[PDB]
Write an enzyme that holds these catalytic residues in place. Sequence first.
Site, PDB file in Angstrom:
ATOM      1  N   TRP A 131       0.841  -1.189   0.000  1.00 45.55           N
ATOM      2  CA  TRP A 131       0.000   0.000   0.000  1.00 45.55           C
ATOM      3  C   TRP A 131       0.880   1.244   0.000  1.00 45.55           C
ATOM      4  O   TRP A 131       1.754   1.375   0.864  1.00 45.55           O
ATOM      5  CB  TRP A 131      -0.876  -0.041   1.252  1.00 45.55           C
ATOM      6  CG  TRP A 131      -1.968   0.960   1.361  1.00 45.55           C
ATOM      7  CD1 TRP A 131      -2.893   1.284   0.412  1.00 45.55           C
ATOM      8  CD2 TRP A 131      -2.292   1.734   2.522  1.00 45.55           C
ATOM      9  NE1 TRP A 131      -3.763   2.226   0.908  1.00 45.55           N
ATOM     10  CE2 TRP A 131      -3.412   2.521   2.200  1.00 45.55           C
ATOM     11  CE3 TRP A 131      -1.730   1.846   3.798  1.00 45.55           C
ATOM     12  CZ2 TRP A 131      -3.989   3.406   3.109  1.00 45.55           C
ATOM     13  CZ3 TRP A 131      -2.302   2.727   4.701  1.00 45.55           C
ATOM     14  CH2 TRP A 131      -3.421   3.494   4.353  1.00 45.55           C
ATOM     15  N   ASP A 212      -0.867  -5.430   9.456  1.00 46.91           N
ATOM     16  CA  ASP A 212      -1.886  -4.538   8.911  1.00 46.91           C
ATOM     17  C   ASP A 212      -3.030  -5.453   8.482  1.00 46.91           C
ATOM     18  O   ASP A 212      -2.870  -6.255   7.560  1.00 46.91           O
ATOM     19  CB  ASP A 212      -1.323  -3.727   7.745  1.00 46.91           C
ATOM     20  CG  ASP A 212      -2.335  -2.755   7.155  1.00 46.91           C
ATOM     21  OD1 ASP A 212      -3.546  -2.910   7.432  1.00 46.91           O
ATOM     22  OD2 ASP A 212      -1.911  -1.842   6.404  1.00 46.91           O
ATOM     23  N   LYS A 247     -13.603  -1.518   5.551  1.00 48.97           N
ATOM     24  CA  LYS A 247     -14.058  -2.277   4.395  1.00 48.97           C
ATOM     25  C   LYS A 247     -14.991  -3.423   4.770  1.00 48.97           C
ATOM     26  O   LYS A 247     -15.997  -3.632   4.088  1.00 48.97           O
ATOM     27  CB  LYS A 247     -12.853  -2.801   3.606  1.00 48.97           C
ATOM     28  CG  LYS A 247     -12.041  -1.691   2.912  1.00 48.97           C
ATOM     29  CD  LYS A 247     -10.606  -1.581   3.429  1.00 48.97           C
ATOM     30  CE  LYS A 247      -9.836  -0.523   2.649  1.00 48.97           C
ATOM     31  NZ  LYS A 247      -8.365  -0.581   2.877  1.00 48.97           N
TER      32      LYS A 247
HETATM   33  C1  LIG Z   1      -7.682   0.367   3.633  1.00 47.65           C
HETATM   34  C2  LIG Z   1      -6.286   0.022   4.061  1.00 47.65           C
HETATM   35  C3  LIG Z   1      -5.721   0.721   5.119  1.00 47.65           C
HETATM   36  C4  LIG Z   1      -6.400   1.919   5.721  1.00 47.65           C
HETATM   37  O1  LIG Z   1      -7.598   1.616   6.368  1.00 47.65           O
HETATM   38  P1  LIG Z   1      -8.495   2.863   6.830  1.00 47.65           P
HETATM   39  O2  LIG Z   1      -9.461   2.246   7.819  1.00 47.65           O
HETATM   40  O3  LIG Z   1      -9.250   3.432   5.649  1.00 47.65           O
HETATM   41  O4  LIG Z   1      -7.620   3.949   7.437  1.00 47.65           O
HETATM   42  C5  LIG Z   1      -4.459   0.400   5.577  1.00 47.65           C
HETATM   43  N1  LIG Z   1      -3.786  -0.671   5.039  1.00 47.65           N
HETATM   44  C6  LIG Z   1      -4.327  -1.376   3.998  1.00 47.65           C
HETATM   45  C7  LIG Z   1      -3.553  -2.524   3.418  1.00 47.65           C
HETATM   46  C8  LIG Z   1      -5.569  -1.026   3.488  1.00 47.65           C
HETATM   47  O5  LIG Z   1      -6.084  -1.755   2.454  1.00 47.65           O
END
Ligand SMILES: *Cc1c(COP(=O)(O)O)cnc(C)c1O
Lengths: 397, 397
Positions: A131, A212, A247
């Site tokens: 990312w 993450d 998400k």
């Molecule tokens: C979406 C995402 C984030 C950030 O998430 P948010 O809740 O929108 O801050 C961080 N790392 C990865 C890999 C993501 O896909």
Amino acid sequence: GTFENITAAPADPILGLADLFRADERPGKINLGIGVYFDETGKIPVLTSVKKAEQYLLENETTKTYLGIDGIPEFGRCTQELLFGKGSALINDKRARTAQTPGGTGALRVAADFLAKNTSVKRVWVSNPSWPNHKSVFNSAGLEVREYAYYDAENHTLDFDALINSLNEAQAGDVVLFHGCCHNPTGIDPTLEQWQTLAQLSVEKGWLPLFDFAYQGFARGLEEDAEGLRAFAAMHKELIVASSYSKNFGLYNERVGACTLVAADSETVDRAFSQMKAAIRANYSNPPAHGASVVATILSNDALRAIWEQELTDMRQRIQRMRQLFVNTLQEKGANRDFSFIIKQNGMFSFSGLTKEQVLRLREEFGVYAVASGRVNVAGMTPDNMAPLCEAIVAVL
Amino acid sequence: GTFENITAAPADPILGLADLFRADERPGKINLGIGVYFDETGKIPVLTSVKKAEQYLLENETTKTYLGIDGIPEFGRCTQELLFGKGSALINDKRARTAQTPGGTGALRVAADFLAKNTSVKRVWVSNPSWPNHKSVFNSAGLEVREYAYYDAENHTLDFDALINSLNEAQAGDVVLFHGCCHNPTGIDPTLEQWQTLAQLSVEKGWLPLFDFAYQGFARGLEEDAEGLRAFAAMHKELIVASSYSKNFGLYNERVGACTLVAADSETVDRAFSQMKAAIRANYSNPPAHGASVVATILSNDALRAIWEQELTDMRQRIQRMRQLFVNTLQEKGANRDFSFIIKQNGMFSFSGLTKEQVLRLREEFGVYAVASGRVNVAGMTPDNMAPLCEAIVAVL
Ligand SMILES: *Cc1c(COP(=O)(O)O)cnc(C)c1O
Ligand SMILES: *Cc1c(COP(=O)(O)O)cnc(C)c1O
């Protein structure tokens, strides 16, 4: 003048693409950029479980008084269960503390600030590719970012030998970042056996694992997607998890995430967590209630949880149907390249293999918006936009 | 072990007070600590205007997709009008840009990170006393914080001579932080003439003013409380405003604030603002929608706005009546110390003049909770707790 000589920043490679898309006046434009879930009609809906929880909150909330620095307690308890599973020894041993944060990004920055200001950590290792905002978060806290090999672009697969060879350069006390599942942008995750190899290697080398976890539930299932993390949790004395509900609850703009700290014992994690709270207080003070209250209401109510889990399953399966449809339609539309690797990738994203020049043509000539790396959001594909999308791709090959 | 050498952080001098209060099992305990508004019954209510707006959002929101990095456009516009006035030249000349942030604290942190990374600012001047978290926020970005003199503890007034003299060594390009109204903790604000004198001095010395505006509407009224900021804005090329809607909308836990940049012209502020957006993206990515959507709905609807303004008036007036009742009841209960200075102070807070030792006795002996600086939240006083509160204070004098 203090602002006179500031240099303009470049646009964000993801969120700046969204600005271009909005300004584009062509009616046929297709958005395959930012990682949100679209339904079969091309809208970005609010989940029914969420609407039901919000109605409950409207009719029963009696105060908006500040939460504690670490947020809603039940939200933390439910998060640890999701990550580590009910009856985990980490939980029963009281080795884990969770702060509710403004999104997964906020959890990553809180972790970074905490590490930079309270430990001797200097370096974070991130997969190549990753990312794009990982480097910015860690650099902004003062930490160096190093890259380890991951993606084999010729075979469209995980280059496990290259990964282990490149990570041998990571020293004890370094942080190594892993995506829990649905790797962003490749959609290629380690197998359980590979996770177990990395965990044992992580122990032997003295790395501090940072997970993450933004897509729990989009690969195989809620419990299955945490297998990698739990294999690490079984072996390590210390780890950090930055998780997101953006998400898997469709709560993107309410900023719902968590930073979970694990240490060797209860006294150590509480001591460390006290400095994590100080770092939060000096950032945004305390976290936003609405989104986390929705998550806590859904997860603590058996009826609402059952609805949510079905809605998540439906999202996961719609994406899987689009991956198949995408591959089949590319062949009908005259692509001679084999795109079958798309079927083996998990989550919202796949590396399409298109070049920057092809991605640019797709945007300028055909109004199809992807990220410049060739990452496409499969969840932005629908039965109605599949044919024009694939005709456009074939036209730039 | 990475977390073994960590030193524990102390509890927050304000937010930790709520933890002690919660743990106190003695009946009749009184909370005069954290700066929230209580009503006459000792509750922290949701405003009616807020509930109506939340109903509208529940019925009409169709997506939770991400906001832009800077948040809701209408929120930024309404904020600028509140700060600078409808028809302000700053707005007509497009010299101001506003980012929606997670609370006023988030606005201060975003400004701090922006300054540290993109300007030559090295030093921030804050009043002695001030809100304790000011130093922590600016230190988190690596900025030195110096203190300037402010409060005359003998006369319970602004020590304007010492203020002027103690800022003599603040250099061109230093940041000087001002509370817009309702100084936290003293409740002593500059007069219009003093603000005008400070505005002229700031221009001559080349300071970058930063206003912390957390209590607009709690001193005299919405427009009147912004007079000092507007005196500064009429004379400066550059300034920063960190504002909060936590207290004047009772939206504390939804984290609703704004960071407003002002530069010499539109091209400059747009260039600087692009770097502020980059600093946000690397922190929490984008801001929480729910609280800011409420504020924008109320400010952009004549009927809701009229309800909210009356609710704010009602809050302001109840605090003023409690200030008078506090002084009268202290006299009734036998205080020989003159507390009449309390009536001249603005907002939720007054420096009582109690020592740390007396504040500790109040907590441990009488169950009355104030901040160790002697700051007492007048908005936590009610007709029902006033007499026992005053008896306790008299007992420790
Ligand atoms: C979406 C995402 C984030 C950030 O998430 P948010 O809740 O929108 O801050 C961080 N790392 C990865 C890999 C993501 O896909
Ligand atoms: C309340 C307050 C803040 C912080 O406001 P939040 O919106 O809760 O983050 C900052 N400065 C002062 C002076 C305050 O009183």
